[PDB]
Ligand binder design. Structure first.
Ligand code: HEM
Ligand code: HEM
Ligand code: FES
Lengths: 106, 54, 67, 379, 62, 49, 81
């Protein structure tokens, strides 16, 4: 039951999404996920072009922590910028146990 | 002053170590502080290059 | 004789404002106490306060002034 | 491993659980603590040991011996305080080790936690008995209290009192029983220590960022060893600094008063670090209520891993909960000063206030928060 | 141009492990003997007439 | 390809003695080392006390 | 297996580093680092300090609140009756 306030919501998102350094620190929403055993199977299905480019950031990322030096603020990741690339493949495996579990009930 | 002395006869003597340790102390920490960094000098000096065949 | 520095320094401090100030309250208490001392009333509370700031003055002084 | 001095005795092969232990890159000083902890434990072991030599527990005599200790024994005074003055430091070394735990929420490691749990619970109980040794009044009544606190169990409570007592009083058995325990005990802790480490070397270390760092690791022997070398000795300073200049500062417990069984001190509080736990005891008017309140109060730590709801680990990327995190911090620090005071009403209410405040902070708020962020963050 | 002590000393001591370690083992001896002595005054020079080292001169050897 | 790489410059961290590349690194090297070790030896000593 | 060998698979990363003797233990330590103080000291200070301030008030607040409650009996009832 929100339309104009819907527009009025996104700011805090865009704000809050800027309130967590990884947007400044070059991450995405995907790469910050807690570890899941499905993510394993998920990560399996990633092609390298996708897979690899995820990787090189982390290597670059952590390094600044040791020195606590945050990226030049322009080069910071942006709110409009997003990619959910991880989740869609994540989504499949989820259903899979569901189906199995569902069958597995009786 | 008398009872102030009583509970701690070593009082006068014991203070010696205080000055003893201090100048002893200011020695090593910057020294350590030097060494540590000397090692960490490499890590914080890293560079990374992503040059995919891609 | 020897007169001490101790009590000597007292009077210069109790000379100070808050001293006689509360010292009046001591009277103000005790005055009210005087006939009404039949009632529980007692001035010990106040005199503490008087003596409290009293010697803080005395602190800075007579220790340095003694032997 | 050709002619490597690691395998020549089979023993040193085990020693390769360290040299080549891989390690994370970005690491706060806040990861010094784990290694930092064991340090205190060692240095202690010697101190109370050589102290144990000249001291004796005999209910009549024992305390007297102590006087002899700091005075006529070679350097007897430096030593007593050492063993003591390590203790609180060690505890402050403790909570920090915990402290790192939640701030990075590393408790994801599951039974390892529970280990870290039990490991602690013993330790505090230890010095508790250790604190009896000086045989001060505050020791005596403090001892006298908590057992008298125990008895409230509805049916069986009674005997267990005089069973642990070994009588109707606080006398010899009560004491010299413990001089075994307060002594025998910590070793087993040390024995336990390694176990708590083992599990960690199942998975390797955790990071600041809640991000598996596996892309980069480091040989441990060169580096963190160094930062240890620094991080280790730093402790000693204040540890050695407090001890000499201002020995009795934290020596806030004042009683060298030979304990009078009849006489009672104007005030009884346990020593500094209990007090919040002790404070919470006061809160419940039900004496039994406070018990299940007090003891359970810490047991909550076991329950934390149940409440991790988020999709990312380390707090440092969830700003909101971080508030609660700090919000809880002072709340702990709060109960201290209230506990640091007698049982007059303005404090009482205030004390009565933060109690239920306390649980709400952990038990509800924390799990509540992350849910919305997922939704806020489109998860 | 002549080598500064380091260039010398390194070639002299730090290169050979023992030699390196040797003077290290040497230095402390005189050091503490010098160190223990020199510091005490700093303590003592401040602490004057309050200790029988100063005081007992009033009555010592009667 | 592989060819395009060239090492980036750290020199800020360096000290100028070797900042000249047309110096043979060997010349300062002589005195260069000990000062590093000098701390090493030096730092070690007081410990023994 | 052997801790480092079988860790993970990684492709086409490159690393660049020097001997420690090549550089100094204070590459503009003061100059470069002193600014960094703020970006971290400002970062959390938004999120952290204020709760304590509330405490500190309560510290004086209740104490003061305590103080009168006892300290002066001839207050609510003065020594008259
Ligand atoms: C004196 C008691 C303890 C000692 C000697 C000790 C020792 C260690 C050591 C050496 C480490 C590895 C370095 C580190 O991660 O800190 C460690 C890690 C850990 N300990 Fe213990 N620890 C102690 C108490 C505890 C307690 C009380 C808990 C939990 C209640 C605990 C849980 C953990 C956890 C979760 C880690 C890993 C933390 C991380 O990943 O950063 N430990 N401990
Ligand atoms: C973390 C390690 C330990 C702690 C926290 C601890 C706890 C205590 C406590 C609370 C006291 C009395 C405090 C005081 O006297 O001021 C104490 C003193 C003592 N502790 Fe422990 N203990 C520890 C390990 C040991 C060890 C390893 C020994 C013996 C080898 C030991 C035996 C003693 C003895 C004999 C005393 C008598 C010295 C005295 O009470 O003044 N404790 N220790
Ligand atoms: S138990 Fe004696 S007053 Fe609470």
């Amino acid at each position: 039951a929100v339309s104009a306030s819907s527009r009025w919501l996104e700011g805090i998102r865009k704000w809050y999404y800027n309130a967590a350094g990884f947007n400044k620190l070059g991450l995405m929403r995907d790469d910050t996920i807690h570890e899941n055993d499905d993510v394993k199977e998920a990560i399996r299905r990633l092609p390298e072009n996708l897979y690899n480019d995820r990787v090189f950031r982390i290597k670059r990322a952590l390094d600044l922590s040791m020195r606590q030096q945050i990226l030049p603020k322009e080069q910071w990741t942006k709110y409009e910028e997003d990619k959910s690339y991880l989740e869609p493949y994540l989504k499949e495996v989820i259903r899979e146990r569901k189906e199995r579990e569902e069958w597995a009930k009786k | 002053t008398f009872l102030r002395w009583a509970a701690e006869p070593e009082h006068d003597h014991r203070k010696r170590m205080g000055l003893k340790m201090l100048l002893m102390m200011g020695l090593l920490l910057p020294l350590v502080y030097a060494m540590k960094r000397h090692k960490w000098s490499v890590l914080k000096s890293r560079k990374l290059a992503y040059r995919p065949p891609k | 004789e020897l007169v001490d520095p101790l009590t000597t320094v007292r009077e210069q401090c109790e000379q100070l404002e808050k001293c006689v100030k509360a010292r009046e309250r001591l009277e103000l208490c005790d005055e009210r106490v005087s006939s009404r001392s039949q009632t529980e009333e007692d001035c010990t509370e106040e005199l503490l306060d008087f003596l409290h700031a009293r010697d803080h003055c005395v602190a800075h002084k007579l220790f340095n002034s003694l032997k | 491993m050709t002619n490597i001095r690691k395998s020549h005795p089979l023993m040193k092969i085990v020693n390769n659980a360290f040299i080549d232990l891989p390690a994370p890159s970005n690491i706060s000083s806040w990861w010094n603590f784990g290694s930092l902890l064991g340090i205190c434990l060692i240095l202690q072991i010697l101190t109370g040991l050589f102290l144990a030599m000249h001291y004796t527990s005999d209910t009549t005599t024992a305390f007297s011996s102590v006087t002899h200790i700091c005075r006529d024994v070679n350097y007897g005074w430096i030593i007593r305080y050492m063993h003591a003055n390590g203790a609180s430091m060690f505890f402050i070394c403790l909570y920090m080790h915990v402290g790192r735990g939640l701030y990075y929420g590393s408790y994801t490691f599951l039974e390892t936690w529970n280990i870290g749990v039990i490991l602690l619970l013993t330790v505090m109980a230890t010095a508790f008995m250790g604190y009896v040794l000086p045989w001060g009044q505050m020791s005596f009544w403090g001892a006298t209290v908590i057992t008298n606190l125990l008895s409230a169990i509805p049916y069986i409570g009674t005997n267990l009192v005089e069973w642990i007592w070994g009588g109707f009083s606080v006398d010899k058995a009560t004491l010299t029983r413990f001089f075994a325990f307060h002594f025998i005990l910590p070793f087993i802790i040390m024995a336990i220590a390694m176990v708590h480490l083992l599990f960690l070397h199942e998975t390797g270390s955790n990071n600041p960022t809640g991000i598996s760092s596996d892309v980069d690791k480091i040989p441990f022997h060169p580096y963190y060893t160094i930062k240890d070398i620094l991080g280790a000795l730093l402790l000693i300073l204040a540890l050695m600094l407090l001890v000499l200049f201002a020995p009795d500062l934290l020596g806030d417990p004042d009683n060298y008063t030979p304990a009078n069984p009849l006489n009672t001190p104007p005030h009884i509080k346990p020593e500094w670090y209990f007090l919040f736990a002790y404070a919470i005891l006061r809160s419940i008017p039900n004496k039994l209520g406070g018990v299940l309140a007090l003891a359970f109060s810490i047991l909550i730590l076991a329950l934390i891993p149940l409440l991790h709801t988020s999709k990312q680990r380390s707090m440092m990327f969830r700003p909101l909960s971080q508030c609660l995190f700090w919000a809880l911090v002072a709340d702990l620090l709060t109960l201290t000063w209230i506990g640091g005071q007698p049982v007059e009403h303005p404090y009482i209410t205030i004390g009565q206030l933060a109690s239920v405040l306390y649980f709400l902070l952990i038990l509800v708020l924390m799990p509540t928060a992350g849910t919305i962020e997922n939704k806020l963050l489109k998860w | 141009v002549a080598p500064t002590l380091t260039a010398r000393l390194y070639s002299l001591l730090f290169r050979r492990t023992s030699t390196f370690a040797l003077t290290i083992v040497v230095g402390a001896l005189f050091f503490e003997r010098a160190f223990d002595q020199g510091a005490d005054a700093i303590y003592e020079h401040i602490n004057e007439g309050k200790l029988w080292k100063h005081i007992k001169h009033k009555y010592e050897n009667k | 390809s592989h060819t395009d790489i060239k090492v980036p410059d750290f020199s800020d961290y360096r000290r100028p003695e070797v900042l000249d590349s047309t110096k043979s690194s060997k010349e300062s090297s002589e005195a260069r080392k000990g000062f590093s070790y000098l701390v090493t030896a030096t730092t070690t000593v007081g410990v023994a006390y | 297996g052997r801790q480092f060998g079988h860790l993970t698979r990684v492709r086409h990363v490159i690393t660049y580093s020097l001997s420690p003797f090549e550089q100094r233990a204070f590459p503009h330590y003061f100059s470069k680092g002193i600014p960094n103080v703020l970006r971290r000291t400002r970062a959390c200070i938004l999120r952290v300090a204020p709760p304590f301030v509330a405490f500190y008030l309560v510290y004086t607040w209740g104490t003061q609140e305590f103080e009168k409650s006892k300290r002066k009996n001839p207050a609510a009832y003065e020594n008259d009756r």
